Amino acid sequence: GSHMRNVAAEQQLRELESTFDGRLGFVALDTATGARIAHRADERFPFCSTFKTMLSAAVLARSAGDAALLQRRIPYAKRDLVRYSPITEKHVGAGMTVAELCAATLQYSDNTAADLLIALLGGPQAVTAYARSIGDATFRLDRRETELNTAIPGDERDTTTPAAMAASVRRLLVGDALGTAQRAQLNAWMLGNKTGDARIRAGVPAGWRVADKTGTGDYGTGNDIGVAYPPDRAPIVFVVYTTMRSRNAQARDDVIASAARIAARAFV
Ligand SMILES: CC(C)(O/N=C(\C(=O)NCB(O)O)c1csc(N)n1)C(=O)O
Numbered sequence: 001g002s003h004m005r006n007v008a009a010e011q012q013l014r015e016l017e018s019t020f021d022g023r024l025g026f027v028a029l030d031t032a033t034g035a036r037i038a039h040r041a042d043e044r045f046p047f048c049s050t051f052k053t054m055l056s057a058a059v060l061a062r063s064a065g066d067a068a069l070l071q072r073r074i075p076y077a078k079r080d081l082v083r084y085s086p087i088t089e090k091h092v093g094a095g096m097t098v099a100e101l102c103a104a105t106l107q108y109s110d111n112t113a114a115d116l117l118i119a120l121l122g123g124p125q126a127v128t129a130y131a132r133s134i135g136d137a138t139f140r141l142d143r144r145e146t147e148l149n150t151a152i153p154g155d156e157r158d159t160t161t162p163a164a165m166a167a168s169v170r171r172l173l174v175g176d177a178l179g180t181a182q183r184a185q186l187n188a189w190m191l192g193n194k195t196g197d198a199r200i201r202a203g204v205p206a207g208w209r210v211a212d213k214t215g216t217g218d219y220g221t222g223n224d225i226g227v228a229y230p231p232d233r234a235p236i237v238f239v240v241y242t243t244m245r246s247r248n249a250q251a252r253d254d255v256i257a258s259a260a261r262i263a264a265r266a267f268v
Contacts, residue, residue: 031174046155170227198257
């Protein structure tokens with residue numbers, strides 16, 4: 001890549017933001033060199049379901065010290081389900097194992113699976129504590145699903161910054177904070193994500209494998225975080241947060257994909 005291309009990419013992110021009635025938070029990191037392409041890197045954004053990556057990492061970290069945890073079954077009933085539970089609704093009664101709940105929350109964004117894992121860890125503050133333990137002094141999880149998606153302007157609950165989340169994704173997916181096996185497992189789950197086809201994945205070449213987690217909420221909030229793995233090249237971290245001025249705006253998959261494409265083309 002080049003410094004000149006990175007600067008030009010940051011200008012194209014400004015131009016992209018001018019095209020819609022909201023704001024764009026963006027960090028992409030080329031881990032070959034640490035080079036960065038950013039827009040609003042240090043502003044807070046409502047992270048919505050992208051926190052499910054941090055949640056799952058916290059569960060994996062606890063399993064490193066507990067050989068029974070990943071196969072532990074957590075029963076739940078139909079009345080326990082929260083809105084948008086495509087996988088967990090199929091397994092009411094005996095429930096699912098902790099590993100299955102991680103996979104469900106990561107790959108389908110299942111909200112009951114998330115709530116079960118937040119509760120297992122001891123509540124939202126345990127997820128914030130895990131983030132602090134991997135060097136993220138910015139991330140905060142305050143509420144559970146689905147209230148954490150309110151995305152009210154000026155509200156700092158359930159927010160992070162693009163820069164903080166890009167460093168955490170890099171540490172979790174590319175570095176070895178989970179230990180080599182846990183790291184591989186988190187990557188595999190996010191590589192098998194079913195909800196991201198129109199977001200970062202739509203902006204990168206077909207040969208780049210993307211481990212990502214999406215988020216969607218009120219105020220047209222549309223997010224995607226993860227790591228792209230070009231073949232035989234260092235990984236590239238992508239964090240894309242967008243949120244709109246109107247409470248009932250639609251999320252914009254095309255803007256997320258465009259922002260990713262700007263950085264993929266600048267780095268490649
Ligand atoms: C998974 C689904 C249904 O998500 N849309 C959701 C939602 O529950 N997202 C879970 B997450 O982004 O924390 C949501 C909350 S408020 C709002 N408006 N939308 C989606 O993106 O298809």
